[PDB]
Amino acid sequence: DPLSETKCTLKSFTVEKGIYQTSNFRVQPTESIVRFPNITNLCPFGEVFNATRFASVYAWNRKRISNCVADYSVLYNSASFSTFKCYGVSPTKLNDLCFTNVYADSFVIRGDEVRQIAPGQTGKIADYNYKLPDDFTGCVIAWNSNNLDSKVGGNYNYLYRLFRKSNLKPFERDISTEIYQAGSTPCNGVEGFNCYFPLQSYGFQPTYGVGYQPYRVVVLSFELLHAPATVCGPKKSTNLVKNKCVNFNFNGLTGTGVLTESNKKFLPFQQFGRDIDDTTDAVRDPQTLEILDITPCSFGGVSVITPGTNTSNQVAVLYQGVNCTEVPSNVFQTRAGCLIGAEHVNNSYECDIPIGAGICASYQT
């Protein structure tokens, strides 16, 4: 009962006369909503990961993924992928998220260097031919491809960079192959003393053991939740309930609140609306393009008015700053909040236990 909730808060079996703050209430959500865009069509992940021929690492390919449904569970669970390492999401969560885009990058490297792909690494892959940004958000996915790629005399069609004037920046692409002048003399034409071609080709023959063997790498990079999602995880959208407290999920923007018709004239390019607080206060539904205000679910302090246990066990409860309709015979609305278990009387008295906004409570016949 509210009295034992005071005894617990005061840590006393006996309570002195007064109004006591106790564990504050919050209106619980009635159900959940999901709203993702009603795209039907799976993404070209087959065309990324089963591709007939990958690029060399210096020649690293980028494919866009956009306007589709992305079932990353099928990647994460596939025994074939030998490393699957993630740097800003956990893979089991990928199916719950929505992404603005994915840049799916594909290329081949030697299997010993599968540790060099991680953001902030050092070593020739990381420095001289393919660098991730240090805040890379995405997952690096790799497997040994000897069994399809490798040839007894060696598929020297696959290449990596040995020389560069500087370590490259994140996602720099270099199609140039002109001579690296390691000597103090510059040098025109195809060769010279300490003049080099910047490339070396992998001797990918199956007589080389693991580590020296070829390792296909796909890097998926994405940015999240802050803009119109083009690609999302496979989740069914629900009906959009309104005017009731609810756990909403719009495009992975999870939250709890009451959803109301919005009078905000968003322009066609907007999708989230934001308060002065730097918090989302409106959203465009992704299946019907109407704006909804996200008002917070009602909440407030719960104070128990105790006339003192030397006098009585009876108590009245103030739900601070809320209506008399939100808490579900002796219910009184006050400016201080909804007061439950005290009777309103027209007889003024001296102040006794204060409630706020001119209201005061007391124990009488």
Partner: protein
Amino acid sequence: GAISSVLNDILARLDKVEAEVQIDRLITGRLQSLQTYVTQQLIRAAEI
């Protein structure tokens, strides 16, 4: 120094045992943001 300030963005993206480390950053900074507020308001309340 968490990956985001939005608490549900952390919990949507990361599994429990990693998310604990990000959330602990936000808890630490937020709690210091309240202790700063309450100290300022106590000092102000003494002036009023």
